[PDB]
Design a protein around this ligand. Structure first.
Ligand SMILES: Cc1cc2nc3c(=O)[nH]c(=O)nc-3n(C[C@H](O)[C@H](O)[C@H](O)COP(=O)(O)OP(=O)(O)OC[C@H]3O[C@@H](n4cnc5c(N)ncnc54)[C@H](O)[C@@H]3O)c2cc1C
Ligand SMILES: NC(=O)c1ccc[n+]([C@@H]2O[C@H](COP(=O)([O-])OP(=O)(O)OC[C@H]3O[C@@H](n4cnc5c(N)ncnc54)[C@H](OP(=O)(O)O)[C@@H]3O)[C@@H](O)[C@H]2O)c1
Ligand SMILES: Cc1cc2nc3c(=O)[nH]c(=O)nc-3n(C[C@H](O)[C@H](O)[C@H](O)COP(=O)(O)O)c2cc1C
Length: 610
C-alpha cells in the first residue's frame, strides 16, 4: 500500500518532458532498458523520464494527449505463468477492468521474455494488445526480447529502429556524454551520517527493528557452515542462519534472499588500477533535481563501500556502460573498440558477445585488457549497475526450526574464457562466513507457492537432482514431524541424484536416517557417474512408473521438481507424460494435457533456478 505520486502527465508538463518510459521489472533488466530509452530522448530533440508504474495512476494515460508529440513506452518482463512483474501488478489488473478511452495516446512496447517458457513474453504481448483495444495507437512494433539468446542485443536492435520511426512520425530528427549525477566530496562528515552498507535507512543494519524485508533486511548470524559433499571436485555447503527475535515467518518451499559483499581484493584492485582513493567519503546527487532517485545508491558513503555493498563489479558490463567509458581510453584502437561494443551488427557486435559476454570479463578485467581505459572512479560508480540479492530455497521446516533458516548452496568458481577464475559473489561471501563477533548475513524471506499438501495423508513425490535437494530437506523434516505428532502421513518419495555416493551425495547421513525411520517411504538416488551410462532421476521415475501412476491417478499424489537445469525439468516432465500415456492409457497429447492439468490444480509444482 504505497502512496502514489502525483499525475505523471502534470509532472511531464512541468518539466517539459514529452516521453515517459514505464518499466515492468523484477530484477532490474527492464528498469535499465527504460532508463536507457529515456536517456535517448535527448539525442532526438525530445525530453523523457523513466518511471515505476506502481507509483502512479496509469489512468492518467488518457491525459497524455495534452502534451504535443507525447509518447509512452513500456519495457515489461514476463514472470511466473505469463504473469506481470510485482510492480506492474496494479497496472495489469487495471488494464483488465477499465473501459477508459486512450484515443490520441501513442505507445510502444518492448517485452522481456525467454523462449524457454510456456508463454513467451505474455506480459509484453498483453500490454501491447490491450492498449490498442482501449483506443491507443501503436507507434512502433512490439519488441519481443529473448533472454535465451542475448536480450541485450534484441533491445539494441529494436531500439535502433524505434527512434527513427518516432522521428519520422513526429517530424523531428537527430542532433548528434551526459552524466546523471554530480560528485560532492564531503570534508566534515559526522561518521554517524555515512552509509556503510545498509540497504535502507541509515544505521538500520546496526539498529534492527521489525518488520524485516527487502528494504530492511535482518542481519542473521551464521550459527553453522559445513561442507556437505565428501569429495573435493566442487564445494557444496550447508549454512544455518539464526532468525531469532526477527519475527520472521517462513514455511518449507519459501526462498531466503541475501545481500552479499564483493571480494575485498577485487574491490581494492579496481581502486588501485584507477589510482582512486576508495576511502573518499562522498555523494552522487542527481543533476536533475526534479527526479526522485537523488542517488544511484545510499549516500554519503565511500567508494570502497559502494563497490563493496551497492555495486555489481563481476557480471559483464552492458553495451552502454562500455560506450560511455570509451571516452576514458587514451589509446585510439581501444576507445574505438569500446565505442563499437553497442553496434547492432558487424565485428563490433561480435566482439562484445565473444570478448565481453562469452568470456565473462568483469569491469576490472576490461580495465586490465585495455590498459588505456582509465576512467574517474566516480563516473564509474554511476555507470555500474546495483548489486542484487541472491535467492536460495530454504532447506529447513519452520515447524522444526522456527528460529533458523537453512541454506544448501554450491559455491561458484570456474575458469572464464577471459583467462581468469571468476568467483560467485554470494557463494564466496557465504563460504567465508564462520560462526566465530558473529558473522552476520543480511537477509529476508520471499514467500513462494512451493508447498507441502495441506492434507497429511496425501502422497508426495519429490524430484530434486543435485543441489535441487534443498527445499526437500525441509519437506522431509516436516513430514517426519507430522508423524511424530502422531498424525497420519501418506507416502513420501524422494528421487535424488548426484555424481557418486562418495563425491557429492548431499545429506547422505540425514537422508539415511529419515529413510530408516520411515519418514521417507522411498529413497531413490541416481548416481550419474557410477557406471558408463548416465543414470538420472527420470530413469528411476520411469522404473517406478507403475507405482507412481497409482499414487498420482488414484492416490491424489502431489509432484515437486527442483533444481538448476531447465532441461532436467523438461526431461522429468516428459517422463511423466510417458508414464501417464502408458497407464491411462491415452495418447501422448492427452497425457500432456493431463499433466499440465495437475499443475493448474496445484499438484505439480516447480522451483527451477534457471
Ligand atoms: C529462486 C532461486 C532459488 C535458488 N536456490 C538456490 C539454492 O537453494 N542453492 C543454490 O546453490 N543456488 C540457488 N539459487 C542460485 C542462486 O540464487 C545464485 O544464482 C547462485 O548461488 C550463484 O550466485 P553467486 O552470487 O555466488 O554467483 P554470481 O556472481 O551471481 O554468478 C552467477 C553467474 O555466473 C555465471 N556462471 C556460473 N558458472 C559458470 C560457468 N561455469 N561458466 C560460465 N558462466 C558461469 C552465470 O551467468 C551465473 O548466472 C537459486 C536461484 C533462484 C533464483
Ligand atoms: C550454474 C551453477 C550450478 C549449476 N548449473 C547447472 O545446473 C546443473 C546441476 O547443478 P548441481 O549443483 O545440481 O550439480 P550437478 O552435479 O550438475 O547436478 C546434476 C545432477 O543430475 C545429473 N543431470 C545432469 N543432467 C541431467 C538431466 N538432463 N536430467 C536429470 N539429471 C541430470 C547430473 O549428472 P551428470 O553431471 O553426471 O550428468 C548430476 O548427477 C549443472 O550441471 C549445470 O547444468 C549452472
Ligand atoms: C522465476 C522467473 C520466471 C520467468 N517466467 C517467464 C515467463 O513465463 N515467460 C517469459 O517469456 N519469460 C519469463 N522469464 C524471463 C524474464 O522475463 C527475463 O529474464 C526478463 O529479462 C527479466 O527482467 P527483469 O530483470 O527486468 O525482471 C522468467 C524469469 C524468472 C527469473
Amino acid at each position: 500500500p504505497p502512496v502514489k505520486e502525483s499525475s505523471f502527465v502534470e509532472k511531464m508538463k512541468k518539466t517539459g518532458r514529452n516521453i515517459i518510459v514505464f518499466y515492468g521489472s523484477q530484477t532490474g533488466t527492464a528498469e535499465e532498458f527504460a532508463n536507457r530509452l529515456s536517456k535517448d530522448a535527448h539525442r532526438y530533440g525530445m525530453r523523457g523520464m523513466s518511471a515505476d508504474p506502481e507509483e502512479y495512476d496509469l489512468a492518467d494515460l488518457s491525459s497524455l494527449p495534452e502534451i504535443d508529440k507525447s509518447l509512452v513506452v513500456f519495457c515489461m518482463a514476463t514472470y511466473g505463468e505469463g504473469d506481470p512483474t510485482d510492480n506492474a501488478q496494479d497496472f495489469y489488473d487495471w488494464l483488465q477492468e477499465t473501459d477508459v478511452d486512450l484515443t490520441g495516446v501513442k505507445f510502444a512496447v518492448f517485452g522481456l521474455g525467454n523462449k524457454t517458457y510456456e508463454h513467451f513474453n505474455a506480459m509484453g504481448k498483453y500490454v501491447d494488445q490491450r492498449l490498442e483495444q482501449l483506443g491507443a495507437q501503436r507507434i512502433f512494433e512490439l519488441g519481443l526480447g529473448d533472454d535465451d539468446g542475448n536480450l541485450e542485443e534484441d533491445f539494441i536492435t529494436w531500439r535502433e529502429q524505434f527512434w527513427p520511426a518516432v522521428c519520422e512520425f513526429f517530424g523531428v530528427e537527430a542532433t548528434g556524454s551526459i552524466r546523471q549525477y554530480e560528485l560532492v566530496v564531503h570534508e566534515d562528515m559526522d561518521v554517524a551520517k555515512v552509509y556503510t552498507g545498509e540497504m535502507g535507512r541509515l544505521k538500520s543494519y546496526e539498529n534492527q527493528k521489525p518488520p524485516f524485508d527487502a528494504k530492511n533486511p535482518f542481519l542473521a548470524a551464521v550459527t553453522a557452515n559445513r561442507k556437505l559433499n565428501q569429495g573435493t571436485e566442487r564445494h557444496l555447503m550447508h549454512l544455518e542462519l539464526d532468525i531469532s527475535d526477527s519475527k520472521i515467518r517462513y514455511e518449507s518451499g519459501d526462498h531466503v534472499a541475501v545481500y552479499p559483499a564483493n571480494d575485498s581484493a577485487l574491490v581494492n584492485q579496481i581502486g588501485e588500477i584507477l589510482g582512486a582513493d576508495l576511502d573518499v567519503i562522498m555523494s552522487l546527487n542527481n543533476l536533475d533535481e526534479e527526479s526522485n532517485k537523488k542517488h544511484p545508491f545510499p549516500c554519503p558513503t565511500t567508494y570502497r563501500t559502494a563497490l563493496t555493498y551497492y555495486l555489481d563489479i563481476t557480471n559483464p558490463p552492458r553495451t552502454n556502460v562500455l560506450y560511455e567509458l570509451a571516452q576514458y581510453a587514451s589509446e585510439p584502437s581501444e576507445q574505438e573498440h569500446l565505442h563499437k561494443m553497442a553496434s547492432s551488427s558487424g565485428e563490433g557486435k561480435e566482439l562484445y558477445l565473444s570478448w565481453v559476454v562469452e568470456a565473462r570479463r568483469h569491469i576490472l578485467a576490461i580495465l586490465q585488457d585495455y590498459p588505456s581505459l582509465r576512467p574517474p572512479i566516480d563516473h564509474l560508480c554511476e555507470l555500474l549497475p546495483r548489486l542484487q540479492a541472491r535467492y536460495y530455497s530454504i532447506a529447513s521446516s519452520s515447524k522444526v526450526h522456527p528460529n533458523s533458516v537453512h541454506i544448501c548452496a554450491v559455491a561458484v568458481e570456474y575458469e572464464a574464457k577471459s583467462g581468469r577464475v571468476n568467483k560467485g559473489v554470494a557463494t564466496s561471501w557465504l563460504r567465508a562466513k564462520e560462526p566465530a563477533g558473529r558473522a552476520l548475513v543480511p537477509m529476508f524471506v520471499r514467500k513462494s507457492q512451493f508447498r507441502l499438501p495441506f492434507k497429511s495423508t496425501t502422497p508426495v513425490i519429490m524430484v530434486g537432482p543435485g543441489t535441487g535437494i534443498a527445499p526437500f530437506m525441509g519437506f522431509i523434516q516436516e513430514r517426519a514431524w507430522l508423524r511424530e505428532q502422531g498424525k497420519e502421513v501418506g507416502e513420501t518419495l524422494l528421487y535424488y541424484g548426484c555424481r557418486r555416493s562418495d563425491e557429492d551425495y548431499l545429506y547422505r547421513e540425514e537422508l539415511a536416517r529419515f529413510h530408516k525411520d520411515g519418514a521417507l517411504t522411498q529413497l531413490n538416488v541416481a548416481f550419474s557417474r557410477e557406471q558408463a551410462h548416465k543414470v538420472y532421476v527420470q530413469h528411476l521415475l520411469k522404473r517406478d512408473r507403475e507405482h507412481l501412476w497409482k499414487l498420482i491417478h488414484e492416490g491424489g499424489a502431489h509432484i515437486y521438481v527442483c533444481g538448476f537445469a531447465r532441461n532436467m525439468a523438461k526431461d522429468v516432465q516428459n517422463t511423466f507424460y510417458d508414464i501417464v500415456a502408458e497407464f491411462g492409457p491415452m495418447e501422448h497429447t492427452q497425457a500432456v494435457d493431463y499433466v499440465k492439468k495437475l499443475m493448474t490444480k496445484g499438484r505439480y509444482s516447480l522451483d527451477v533456478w534457471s
